Amino acid sequence: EERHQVLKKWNETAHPHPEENFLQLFEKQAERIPEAIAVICEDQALSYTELNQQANRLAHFLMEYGVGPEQYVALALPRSAEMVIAMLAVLKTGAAYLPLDLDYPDERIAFMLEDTKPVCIVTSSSVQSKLSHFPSCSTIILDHPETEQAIKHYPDTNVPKTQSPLHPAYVIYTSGSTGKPKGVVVPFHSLNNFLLAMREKFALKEHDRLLAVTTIAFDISALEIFLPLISGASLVVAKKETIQDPQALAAVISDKEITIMQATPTLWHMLVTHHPDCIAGLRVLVGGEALSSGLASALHRLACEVTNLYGPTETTIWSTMSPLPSIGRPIWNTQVYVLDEQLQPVPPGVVGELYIAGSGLARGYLRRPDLTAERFVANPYGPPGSRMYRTGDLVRWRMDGSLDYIGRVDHQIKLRGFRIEIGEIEAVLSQCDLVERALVVAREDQPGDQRLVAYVIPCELAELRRYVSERLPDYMVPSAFMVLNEFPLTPNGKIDRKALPAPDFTRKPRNPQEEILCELFAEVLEIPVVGIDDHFFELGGHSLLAARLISRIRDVLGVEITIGKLFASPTVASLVKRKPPVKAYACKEDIPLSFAQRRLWFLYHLEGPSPTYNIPVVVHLTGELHYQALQQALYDVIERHEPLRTIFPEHSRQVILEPHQARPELMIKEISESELSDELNAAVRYRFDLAAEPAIRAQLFVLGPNRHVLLLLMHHMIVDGWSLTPLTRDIAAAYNAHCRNQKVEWAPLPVKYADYALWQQEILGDETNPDSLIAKQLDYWKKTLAGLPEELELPTDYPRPAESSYEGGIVDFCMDAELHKRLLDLARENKASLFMVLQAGFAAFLTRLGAGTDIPIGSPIAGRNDDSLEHLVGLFINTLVLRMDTSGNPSFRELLGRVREVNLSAYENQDIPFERLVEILNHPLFQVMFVFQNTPEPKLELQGLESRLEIRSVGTAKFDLTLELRERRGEDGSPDGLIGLFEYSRDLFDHTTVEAFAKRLCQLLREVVMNPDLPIGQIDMLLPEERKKLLAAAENLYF
Amino acid sequence: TNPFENKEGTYLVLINDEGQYSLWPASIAIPPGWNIAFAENTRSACLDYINAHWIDMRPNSLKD
């Protein structure tokens, strides 16, 4: 009836081999085109003749060694031409090769070796150290001059091919989640049939090149290696270091003129998303996973000749294929059978389990009779005594000789190289007391980006994510949670994906290390910005990206992290995880100053009330402003943050005033615009009496009925740069709460600033203990900052007077976006951060001006490592003394390395107050300050008001010379340039001088960007305006 | 469930001309070119038989 069609008609795939091995095709090719390029790898390249000859000599060598059929030889070689020569030679000798990838765990490699028990292990010197070999077999090192010279004393002629096709050609292992890997013994004629089939499929003229990016640990490589060689094509082998980086791989695909390429949907998605240009004319081979219908829609547009491949390892590489979820018709000598539970064929359109039969079938599993007999079963639809392999995949016959994939029988979904069991996810997700039902499904918000979305039905918010993540791996937790009414259905009686709600698709770093890590995460995930509590695997992070991330971490921070530790700690905050946590402290008799505060209080107790450390927040408000709401807002935010209402009397102690006790005032003055500057210049220069007054004043200036200027004048004693964000967020919170006439939405503070002080003191109390962390770091600083120079020697216009006037000036300068990008690229290319690059440029700048070979410069740190200090408004800023050495006249590269070492060394000792170091050693330790800002400036964002916030200058100088550089990011996330300023002492410099310092600094940066290998002593330090006159003088002299 | 994956069921051990062993559900008719090596018994016992008899897994075409 119709059973004849699904058995015989659609399986009319039978070709008798024309008495030609793929090897023999390769040899005939070598004879035909001797000078043709066969294999390219990195710099080196081999011809067909060279490849064939070396393979032959190695073949006769191994043959003399005692290697024959039914014997395995391990290939512990690096990805190179040598591995091609190796496996080819082994195929020539008649034996089988065991491909080893050395990146895999030592336990698994040792398992492969102990299980296979090969005769000998061939290897290179680059790898021979990695092998803790067993005494079961000897190890031949191909690099060894003795061995190498031994190879060349053997014929370079072809070998006889009188071997049986039933003998194994290679063995591939697979982990089928059983717990123990199985050795799939692939016979020769299967491989030959496959390779001949694929050779017939793709024309592959001499001009074609194939880029191999799959490891030899998988059968796919056999296609990527032997297929171009049986044709007249060339083969470009790529190292793992190239495969990990997309910008490198995409560069190779263009620079090597690659014509054809095979890969997994993951890699393809990694390329098409950000590097489409390289896949313009490329011939694409997809396989290994169900191709997303968006990804395919992208490939069929950008690329050409996109062929979808399918097959398990037990049927040798690929069994079915089809040009563009159709897995299409089978290949040569491959019968496909869609059967039911009674092993009977089903009519077209009916879903059944797939059984593959034919010449593709392997011998079975190495020394595993039971598993073989479990899956390699008897075949009733083939020749008498034949065998089927049950895939475990559910397939359905299409209308015309095609197969539609449905899904596996274990109800697992393969995504991003993971075997995800959705059932467990919905199980633990619905196990919640507040969750009744749930369904998880992978949807695509971005083209090719498959993300797990969870749709939930509640019982009769974000904590659910914490509930799911504390019981499941990070690659299983959904990227989006959507609550719905009921799961919709299609007329066919299936869940409608299209009728479901469209997915939403979605902290800050606390120390230098965390920011470096976040930068790395962002660079690897190819997304603009990441946070301290973002998960790596939820954002498309897979195993390969994990590998590259580990590499970049190992090179940027100098620490090797196991991938298991990365899975266990998928977020940066977990990665960095040591200082004791800050618990809440009981009411103390007195509260000691924080060490950051102690310094300021010392300067205040010595000099007196000064506007030096004032922090004036100026906000321009446009629109209708509710005054009472503003006043109540200020009162509220003061009531919340105790440091805003704290006095510091003499006894040195903190005295927190009650909300009603410290009466907060709001001054309201109406002035003309033409005076707004003047008044401000006065208002900012108010001098706080810290002994008896809370260091905060609020002054509203009325320019017009809708135009206002709000001034929040605070002191650095109670507020830092960080605190300016939770502060400005609370003021907006209260204001908008009074206008809407609703209760303010606040997040309760687990600890107060007093707790930070008490914790600080309690920690530093263990300075006596030699085994304490603080004693260790203090020892570190006692060694590194030992022998610091008394004072730097900058080209000052005026000699340093006795009494510091503390009057300061400011010079603003800008650095265009292009140069910004160039600096970033330099940084990333030389294992450093932009921070370190700017540091190097600055130190070189100072040394060039004659500040000496040894220059210590200070830089501030957030000093907020604890999570409880995240929203506290107070003074937490620490300061690291980066001691830089510019001696030896080094290149900017070498200097950058030095600065990198200094910074990385300093980061591991950041948990100690600068004040303590000042107390222990004898501005104290550095006269030059460098502040680097990466975060964007805070804003109020009040309701019904246009806000424009800026931090006004007081006109003072905290140091002799301070350089502040703020990095601005674009709308996309791309570099939009650098905004910098020089804060200089007015009594040591002129405005013109520092104005020249800016220009010289920028020019220096461009200079070292053009050539990073340039010695800093050869940097041009002259300005164009100076060069003109300079050349004019000599123009008048010599003529 | 799969015919072979069923644990609580009756099975068979079929042998090939090439000496290749194969598990088989007792209910389903035996294919041509396959003879019974181990009669109707528990799946575990069958797999034990296979483990105890199918020593050399290369076809008898190679054995000589």
Ligand SMILES: *P(=O)(O)OCC(C)(C)[C@@H](O)C(=O)NCCC(=O)NCCS[C@H](CN)CS(=O)(=O)NC[C@H]1O[C@@H](n2cnc3c(N)ncnc32)[C@H](O)[C@@H]1O
């Ligand atoms: P990290 O934790 O270290 O590791 C993950 C890592 C990404 C590093 C690693 O997976 C990796 O490098 N990946 C290697 C890529 C790879 O192994 N590719 C598989 C080729 S083997 C085989 C072909 N001989 C494909 S298979 O094993 O996946 N087939 C088994 C299974 O896949 C399904 N399937 C295959 N083709 C399909 C198509 N075309 N459509 C749908 N489904 C397909 C199928 O279910 C089959 O049973």
